[PDB]
Design a protein around this ligand. Structure first.
Ligand SMILES: [Mg+2]
Ligand SMILES: [Mg+2]
Ligand SMILES: [Mg+2]
Ligand SMILES: [Mg+2]
Ligand SMILES: [Mg+2]
Ligand SMILES: [Mg+2]
Ligand SMILES: [Mg+2]
Ligand SMILES: [Mg+2]
Ligand SMILES: [Mg+2]
Ligand SMILES: [Mg+2]
Ligand SMILES: [Mg+2]
Ligand SMILES: [Mg+2]
Ligand SMILES: [Mg+2]
Ligand SMILES: [Mg+2]
Ligand SMILES: [Mg+2]
Ligand SMILES: [Mg+2]
Ligand SMILES: [Mg+2]
Ligand SMILES: [Mg+2]
Ligand SMILES: [Mg+2]
Ligand SMILES: [Mg+2]
Ligand SMILES: [Mg+2]
Ligand SMILES: [Mg+2]
Ligand SMILES: [Mg+2]
Ligand SMILES: [Mg+2]
Ligand SMILES: [Mg+2]
Ligand SMILES: [Zn+2]
Lengths: 53, 93, 123, 112, 43
RNA sequence: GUAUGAGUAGCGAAAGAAGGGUGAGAAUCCCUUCCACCGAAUAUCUAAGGUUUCCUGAGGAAGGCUCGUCCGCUCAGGGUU
RNA sequence: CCGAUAGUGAACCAGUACCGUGAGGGAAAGGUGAAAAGCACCCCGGAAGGGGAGUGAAACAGUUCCUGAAACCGUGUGCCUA
């Protein structure tokens, strides 16, 4: 329950190859003209489905 | 000792200014002075007629100005009430 | 299989009663995702009970609504309570509509803990 | 000349390993898309990197007279800074070290 | 569970105080040693 | 002085919810309503001990096992008859 | 004879901070520039912090500030690699 040998740099980076985080799923609101999350209410023009809320 | 030695200076704050209207005057006195000595110091300096005297002992506050620690001077506050028929001490002109 | 919301059986029922009553009064509240998805069903069943309009239905609903004042009207000051609003205002609005008295709109993560917040309203 | 501009935020209280996971998303992208990416990534390092990026764009437009619409992010990296050493009292009368780390954030924008 | 140090002003002054030190040959030796080392507080 | 273990263990008994406000920024600060807990105490006094931690106005570097517009924290003035 | 791990424990508000009921034990910490001439003013930000402009011989000397090695942490690329 304790490391026998210390971890090199190569093995550390090899393990960390999968610790990234993904890109957001966004596109551009037709009314706003700038980016927003799909299936979400855009915060600039305050509209969803072409209707203000 | 001398009357002007056991009376140091007036206290000018919001509380003292508030109570000046009630013929009460707040002063700063020596740390070795009893209230009788205070009553005789005043009335001899200001030529009034004192009714009662209350005294208060304050400790020093721990201050600091960077790596340096110390205490402010210990005080002794006194409140002197003159009688109804006496005059009034001016304080601020 | 409904949904446990990180809290025990008695605590969960108390939470559902609070959110259901808050939605009747204000008609537009902002909560998390699962919490709104759960209060949706209870609010809609409660509105159906109001649609029935009976005295028995009124007692059934009163066994769930929290007893709090919506607002005071000058009839003489006489407050109106949540059950009165449910059976006099909210229920007649959807007399011609069968189901689906609520909608859910997504907002985005909360700052403090990244919780996905939504806004749920009764229209 | 001077086709690029940069901005640096020095000694920001954020561990470098937690900022070098957000700053890898915006490397080599348009500034508009990079701002949008930082806006919708729910990490704690997004506002800081976004502020640095907007400052870099602002002083690229003001000092060097470039176009906002024609900019890309060339370089972006996080460098270490001084650490504050604190302790946490463990069981049986002994303490363990705690490292409050800081970082330096740099972003460089330029014409395409 | 109670610990070894239970503070009290009077006990401290009666056991480790200055007059207690000055009332004995060996207490005076302690005071002289502390003066020699140049310590800020005696007793 | 800086690494590996590693973004891993842990974050120290407990019921919260919504609506307004402030603010560059709010699960965490203020206000309202509902709910819940202790009640021979988790209530009210007073000794020992501590020694300004008390109040007002400002502040968010560090401290607070998160956040903080807040604080028993920082600054400046007061307060014990 | 030493030259900041050396030389007194102490080149710096040192028998101080801190530890202990007490006797007692007992540290760490030097250097901007010849001269503050210590960055007017503009821009991003709440601020911190930056990019220009200016002083300077030098700002890659900017209030632990002469020189700035190694461990350690990164960005780019020539050759190799499932
Ligand atoms: Mg008295
Ligand atoms: Mg005193
Ligand atoms: Mg003094
Ligand atoms: Mg029960
Ligand atoms: Mg031990
Ligand atoms: Mg212990
Ligand atoms: Mg493991
Ligand atoms: Mg695990
Ligand atoms: Mg806790
Ligand atoms: Mg709110
Ligand atoms: Mg009970
Ligand atoms: Mg207070
Ligand atoms: Mg914090
Ligand atoms: Mg305070
Ligand atoms: Mg040297
Ligand atoms: Mg030495
Ligand atoms: Mg002591
Ligand atoms: Mg010099
Ligand atoms: Mg500035
Ligand atoms: Mg500058
Ligand atoms: Mg310059
Ligand atoms: Mg020049
Ligand atoms: Mg020189
Ligand atoms: Mg240097
Ligand atoms: Mg090197
Ligand atoms: Zn839109």
């Amino acid at each position: 329950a304790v490391p026998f040998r210390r971890t090199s740099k190569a093995k550390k980076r090899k393990r960390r190859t999968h610790v990234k985080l993904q890109l957001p799923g966004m596109n551009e609101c037709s009314n706003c003209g700038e980016y927003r999350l799909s299936h979400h209410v855009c915060p600039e023009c305050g509209q969803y489905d072409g209707k203000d809320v | 000792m001398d009357a002007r030695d056991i009376i140091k200076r007036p206290v000018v704050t919001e509380e003292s200014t508030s109570i000046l209207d009630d013929k009460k005057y707040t002063f700063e006195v020596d740390t070795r002075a009893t209230k009788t000595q205070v009553k005789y110091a005043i009335e001899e300096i200001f030529d009034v007629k004192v009714a009662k005297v209350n005294v208060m002992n304050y400790k020093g506050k721990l201050k600091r100005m960077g790596r340096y620690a110390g205490y402010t001077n210990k005080r002794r506050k006194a409140i002197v009430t003159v009688t109804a028929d006496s005059k009034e001490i001016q304080f601020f002109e | 299989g409904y949904r446990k919301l990180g809290r025990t059986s008695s605590q969960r029922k108390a939470l559902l009663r609070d959110l259901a009553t808050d939605l009747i009064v204000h008609e537009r509240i902002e909560t998390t995702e699962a919490r709104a998805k759960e209060i949706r069903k209870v609010v809609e069943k409660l509105i159906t009970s109001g649609k029935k309009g009976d005295l028995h239905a009124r007692r059934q609903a009163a066994a769930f609504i929290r007893h709090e004042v919506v607002e005071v009207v000058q009839v003489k000051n006489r407050p109106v309570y949540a059950l009165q609003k449910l059976f006099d205002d909210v229920a007649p609005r959807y007399a011609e509509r069968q189901g689906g008295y609520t909608r859910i709109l997504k907002k985005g993560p909360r700052r403090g803990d990244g919780a996905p917040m939504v806004i749920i309203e009764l229209v | 000349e001077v086709t690029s501009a940069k901005a640096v935020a020095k000694t920001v209280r954020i561990a470098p390993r937690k900022a070098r996971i957000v700053i890898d998303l915006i490397r080599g992208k348009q500034v508009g898309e990079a701002i949008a990416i930082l806006k919708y990534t729910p990490r704690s390092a997004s506002p800081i990197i976004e502020k640095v990026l907007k400052s870099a764009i602002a002083n690229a437009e003001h000092n060097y007279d470039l176009d906002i619409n024609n900019l890309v992010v060339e370089e972006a990296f996080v460098d270490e800074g001084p650490t504050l050493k604190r302790f946490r009292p463990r069981a049986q009368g002994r303490a363990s070290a705690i490292n409050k780390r800081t970082s330096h954030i740099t972003v460089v924008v330029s014409e395409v | 569970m109670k610990r070894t140090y239970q503070p009290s002003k009077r006990k401290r002054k009666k056991v480790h105080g200055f007059r207690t030190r000055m009332s004995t040959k060996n207490g005076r030796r302690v005071l002289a040693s502390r003066r020699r080392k140049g310590r800020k507080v005696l007793s």
